[PDB]
Design a protein around this ligand. Structure first.
Ligand SMILES: CSc1ncc(Cl)c(Nc2ccc3c(c2)CC(=O)N3)n1
Ligand SMILES: CSc1ncc(Cl)c(Nc2ccc3c(c2)CC(=O)N3)n1
Ligand SMILES: [Cl-]
Ligand SMILES: [Cl-]
Ligand SMILES: [Cl-]
Ligand SMILES: [Cl-]
Lengths: 123, 4, 123, 4
């Protein structure tokens, strides 16, 4: 018999992005080919199968720095981190391959699906 | 607010 | 020129609630008349003007335990904490006064608004 | 996915 507030989830995510932009309560640095990205472990886990696996690990859950595979492109990661905190994906002809490869590595199934569809349309 |  | 994934914010919140239910990466205990509630500081801040003020304070941001005012009802708090993580509010004739009082104290404007409207309809 |  609950009532539901339609905009609540969007409002929560908007506030989480405001905390990220002001670097409030960020608890991890993700290192991608020397570029560094500060974020909230919980948001990373909520969006990515890879971060979910990393931060549920009894040793890795305590790490303040995570280094990604050197094949990961920092721009592709940045676009995906922005998507995690906003639901908006900056998908362009010039970045689609790097975004898809990064989303496959991060295990972000819905992003992988839209990249596959956009690539299939161009062939 | 809505009835979910 | 971004594309947007409609269900992303809801999916993020659903996963944050799964982490709460399994007590994963919870970093604060909220004490309400001896009852204890574990939660994520970022989610509390994203939902409440009171928690936002508390955890942006340079001394309080480091506290692992927060004690609420003794006038706060634990059931009212529990219903509001559930709403924070799900967008669903269990508003009933028997709890509406305690829920409204708790939402006013927590500074959850949209909850206060619906309680005021539901109370006005019953008079 | 939509055009926001
Ligand atoms: C599976 S239970 C669960 N519970 C809590 C969290 Cl934080 C979580 N996240 C997560 C797991 C897998 C995947 C994603 C997020 C995005 C994706 O495409 N795959 N999962
Ligand atoms: C105002 S900028 C901002 N930036 C980040 C966060 Cl985490 C935040 N939360 C917050 C503040 C006030 C209120 C709420 C959340 C719910 C409500 O009714 N009032 N606000
Ligand atoms: Cl470390
Ligand atoms: Cl995704
Ligand atoms: Cl403490
Ligand atoms: Cl609210």
């Amino acid at each position: 018999s609950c009532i539901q507030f339609t905009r609540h989830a969007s409002d929560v995510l908007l506030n989480l992005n405001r905390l990220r932009s002001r670097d409030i309560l960020t608890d991890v640095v993700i290192v991608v080919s020397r570029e560094q990205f500060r974020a909230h472990k919980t948001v990373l886990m909520a969006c990515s199968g890879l971060f979910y696996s990393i931060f549920t690990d009894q040793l890795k859950c305590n790490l303040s720095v995570i280094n990604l595979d050197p094949e990961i492109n920092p721009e592709g990661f940045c676009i995906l981190l922005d998507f995690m905190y906003t639901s908006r994906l900056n998908l362009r002809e010039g970045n689609i391959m790097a975004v898809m490869a990064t989303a496959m590595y991060l295990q972000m199934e819905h992003v992988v699906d839209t990249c596959r569809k956009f690539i299939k349309a161009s062939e | 607010w809505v009835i979910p």
